[PDB]
C-alpha cells in the first residue's frame, strides 16, 4: 500500500504528481463589493456587545 513517501528515503526522483490549480481558480483577485454606510450616525450603536 503505502508507497514509501518520496521524501522519506534518499533517492532523487524526477517526475511526480503535482496538483496545480486550473484556469478557474484565479487568486489574489481584487474583488469588488458594495459597501453601505449606515445612514443616521446618531443611530449607529457602539456599546453593549
Amino acid at each position: 500500500q503505502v508507497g514509501i513517501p518520496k521524501l522519506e528515503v534518499d533517492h532523487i526522483s524526477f517526475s511526480n504528481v503535482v496538483s496545480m490549480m486550473t484556469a478557474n481558480i484565479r487568486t489574489g483577485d481584487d474583488m469588488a463589493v458594495e459597501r453601505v454606510n449606515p445612514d443616521d450616525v446618531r443611530a449607529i450603536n457602539i456599546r453593549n456587545a
Binding site: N45, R47, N48, A49
Partner: protein, 81 residues
Amino acid sequence: IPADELIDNLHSWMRSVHLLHVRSEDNTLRYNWMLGVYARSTNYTTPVGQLVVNAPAILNYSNPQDAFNSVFVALGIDYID
C-alpha cells in the same frame, strides 16, 4: 448622620427611581428587574437598554431563563455585561 436628615432625605431619592415597565394581568409574570434596573442605570442607551424603552413588555417573563434568552434572541448577542 442625623437619623432625621437621613431617612427623610433617602426617602426622596428612593421615591425617585421610576423603573420603566408595562404592567399586566397574567398571574405568573415577574420582572427580571436586575437587567431592567440596569437599563435605567445608564439612561437607556446601551442597546439592551435601548430595547426596554420603547419595548417595555420584554422584561416581564415567566420561565426564569426564557426571561433573558428573549432579550438576546432579539438584539442577537453572545453576552450582556
